[model samples]
Target chain A: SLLNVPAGKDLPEDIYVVIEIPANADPIKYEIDKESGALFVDRFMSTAMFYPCNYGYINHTLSLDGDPVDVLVPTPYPLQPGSVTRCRPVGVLKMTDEAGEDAKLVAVPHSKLSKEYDHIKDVNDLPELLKAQIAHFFEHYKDLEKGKWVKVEGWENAEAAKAEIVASFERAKNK
Target chain B: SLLNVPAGKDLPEDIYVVIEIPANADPIKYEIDKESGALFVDRFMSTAMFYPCNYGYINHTLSLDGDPVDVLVPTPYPLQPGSVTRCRPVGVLKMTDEAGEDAKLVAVPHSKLSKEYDHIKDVNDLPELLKAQIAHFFEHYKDLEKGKWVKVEGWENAEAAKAEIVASFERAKNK
Candidate 1:
């Protein structure tokens, strides 16, 4: 099953991205049932704040938050939930939620794609407004749930992002 | 109504603490009913990770997460919900949750009686283990809900804590 798949050690070089669509999407948010390893619709977002990028998680790596480390794939097309794609880390969004620090690693498809972002190296390479929009989306995403606002600290380069992935991988292994 | 009461500009001086007991407590967690202006039991926590200190929020001040700024009062007895106590800021716990940065401001009673901590000015002045436990509590508090683990960045002195309160107060006023 996708949830049980081990996230290999070749992160940054070869990382697997597990996609999960948000409520604004056609099918809505898909959550994995830990027991059955089946994907199911969790619920809908209270607001119309749709995901601007393909959202997913880094397989096998457990974040300090207990769940798998989250990742955002910024391709033009939407990826289906449970779809696994190899990607390379480009940057990281350091954010803190009401619970604690929940940073999202940003990446691009490893295989050749559109010319614009295929070679992107850092979050800085992306259009300024795109970064701002991503930040804004997370900031107010939980408004309807009465959840706390998210604070985006800043962006980190690929190297830093890789370090985080490795750390999470280690933590997962130990756990 | 209690929700409408201003948090006051005298934070770090005479800040009002809005108490909310956790589920493990005798009466369990109490949430304010926005419509009726009444306090009612929200629900019991699935786990027994009870609060080590009196938990509450700063009256009227809105945090980035939408709720009032959270504050934890370290008193020997658990205070009932809706009960307000004027306290003085001593430190701040820099923590991030899943939704975003939701830091907890730490304070002690303003009046005399607590000789050991009455003059405390910063988190560093408290016992090291006490700080660790506080961080640990928040880190795992939402485990049962499948919430992300909280990351505690560090502690801030009273001045910084005061600044945070004032900033939130300003934001609340502007909103």
Candidate 2:
């Protein structure tokens, strides 16, 4: 099953990302059932804020928050939920919810930036405003719930993103 | 060593804190040597921003960041660093630095607008603007360093503050 697949069995140079929610899709949220591996609509986000980019996770890895390690793969086109996707890891966003540390690895499956995919190898490689918007999205998306908040601690480079992936992959394997 | 004293060995009702930097002091930063009980001046805080409150930590407790749990005891009169101080627990300011999950328990060693410390029992008990200033101080103190930033995730009540103190105290014993 795709859910049971090892994230590294493919190639170490790139990451296998799975989209659970597409960019600019419905305000509705979807979740993957850990037991059965099915995508189900969870609830509409409490706020009008929508996903600024493609959202999902590194298949079969656990993060510091005890959920699948999340990956934000920005694409000009909204990819469908549950699409088999691949992207070159570029950076990571460090943030925390009321619960604990939440980090998102940023990658581009198909770069279509005025900023050029060819040179956008690290987070710093992206436009400053784009990075600001990515962090801005997380900071406010849950604000309507009032106390449900997220703090963007800023970003890290490609190497840290890769390390986060490997560390999470090892976590899943140990479990 | 003074640092070896368990935060709760004396009482469950109030907290015992050790101030490392006094309020409105030099921009110079000071750090406690984990290896010894010594209080040492590390470096001037990389900015003109000085402490807006008495800076200290709960005795013997270890927090998520691996340091002794930090506390922000605000007083009109600047308290002396390396001096013993007592205060009433009020609330916690949640935040993050380059490191993960740094939280500060906010308390009062003094007070009032003809309003009394005797009545100010929670974070909300303080003037709304004062609370704003507390969060504001942390948010901008490191800004002069350019890339080094801090995010204030807002504040929690006294109940949560007490729980954090206990949680950290337990962590130290386990360590």
Candidate 3:
């Protein structure tokens, strides 16, 4: 099920948006159409119904399973009671209030998801995603050193990299 | 030519050591033994003679031809002043350090050898070796979370992962 929000409401233009999902709600993939300014959800699917989660903190288990890539979703800071909805990836936009790009897809490892839920498996996947997301952010916004690699902390060793990436996700979610 | 310094002599541990050849130093290979502290130099009879000269940068390309590895030449960060030393991977060390069961090596590519003066091609090789070495460093150090992939800053993307790994190398060198 999906909820429709009138286009161009009170939501700020370019911020890290996240919608609150109910614990019992069946997992679903969501997407946003930049051209239409509308949101949509895929056929209901449970996040628990995937790899790494089933493997339990195992690494290198995520095969490019040929599944269609999930779309990006966006929402508000906190979950409004009775307003839980599915979300997905959309193109990031830049706002003056925001120092960086408005939107970008950052796929966190299911393992890194809150421990409150049993569905998450591997948190190691976060660092690589965070690195890529930052690169995407920089590539889209700044042209300096195009196609060049930029450095960040906690990613020197693979394990540290994993922790940093996981932290970014948790940080974003908690905010 | 081999240089034999008396064992346990009061030689400056930080003195820059190099092999100087008055003859055509076209391309020479050097090997150091951690056990006996012996330096050996010999001509590498091959057509490929590309070495980099810029110091303080890890040659990522060196690993492309083979496995990513490292060798600890005694002190002196770069090659000794007058000698042409082409560092290559001869073997690996499996031993203990302050960290614990660590692997060392007898080849070159210490801080001295560069692509201009050394036969290195890829910049990615250093991170690859750094990853392996740090992994080893963590395994033994057990106390320090130095190089495990457990934490990351922006590893969600390949570029970010690459950047993080590169950054990790810089951080490790500084330490």
Candidate 4:
């Protein structure tokens, strides 16, 4: 996905990146290139997006094809006092990877986009700051994916899927 | 890109989609639908992401591939608050006719969800609401794409790109 931020908005002129795993995914370690910013999924799977924002604060959405797919957990009123640090917010989805013929979009309603940097601004330093933030976001997803959840498509048997997912988390923690 | 959200916290899922048109050529208002939802793209050559969110916002990027695609005016925000009573906030992106060799990664910002469902709530009613939002988002982009600039490799130059895009937008507006 390509984006263009007006050059003088205290934003990065360009954002070039690969994926980064988050730290939350323990036990499972993802391989990532610190320089090129490419992330490899070790186990389970997760996706992350990173960017910089200026001007009070703005909210955005994620769309597939042209329809809205994910849900955003809104920030409470008064814009949480202080700087809005850039952090990763993962969307945990219960989707099926079945062929286009029969697939369901079942997304759970719980994910976290940390509030470490709320209302923080450094317009002049946004370029580098955005870069670091993207890196952090990617790394977070990479880590969290360590023992995340495995594909539970055909295993529509809810109990079985839950057991397998629980076991993956346990194994990830031990690793 | 896949993302990981923390447990107990809801995740925001956003997908960025790009559709290309032949240089100096245009496309009719086209719509893509999936079991989950549908998206519409006008004749103008641009990319968009449709996702669920409180703000009913879509952040559109104005670049093609890695190179900067110029536009005469700042790309219009492409949407109005009233236009998306049933919309969601998605990420920003650029549009192109062909997938260039190096398409830069656009930033998908972390969004704060909202709680302003005036009269809509039932999951069954979501599709129409979302469709309205998606149409509004696309119309917003249509306006931005109109009389704007586009740059793609092995395609028409910026001047021609602009003319073609404007013509496309005209068709959509009339349609």
Listed models, DockQ each? 0.01, 0.01, 0.01, 0.03
| Tens-digit lDDT track of model 1 for A1-175 | 8777757537656788878763125425676666886788876544333566788888778787788778888776767777876788888889988768989888887764456566587778876656766675676556545545678788888888888888888887865
| Model 4 C-alpha lDDT per residue in residues B122-164, reported as the tens digit of each score | 2233334333333233233332243543332222232343333
| Candidate 2 per-residue lDDT over residues A33-104, each given as its tens digit | 777889998876543245767888877678889987788877767888887577778899999888799998
If both were scored by DockQ, which would come out higher, candidate 2 or candidate 3? 2
Looking at every candidate separately, what fraction of the true A–B Cα contacts under 8 Å does it contain? 0.00, 0.00, 0.00, 0.00
Models, CA RMSD each: 16.1, 17.0, 23.9, 23.6
User: What DockQ score does model 2 reach against the true complex?
Assistant: 0.01
Residue A78 of model 3, lDDT score: 18
Which lDDT tens digits does candidate 3 get at residues B59-140?
A: 2211211211232332224444223334433233344443332233333342354443243222333335543543443233
Q: DockQ for the candidate 4 complex?
A: 0.03
lDDT of 2 by residue, B1-175 (tens): 7566456433334667788888767567787787897889887553323566788888878789988778887665787778766666788999988887898888666332223476778878877755665676677656545567788888999889888877887887765
Docking quality of model 3: it rates as: incorrect
Candidate 4: tens digits of C-alpha lDDT, residues A1-175? 1112111111111111111222122222343332442444444322311111211111121122221121111222212211232222221223322122111111111123434333322222223333333223323323223343233222123233223333333443344
Model 3: residues with Cα > 4 Å off, grouped in runs: A1-103, A109-175, B1-93, B96-102, B110-141, B144-175
**Between prediction 2 and prediction 4, which has the larger lDDT?**
2
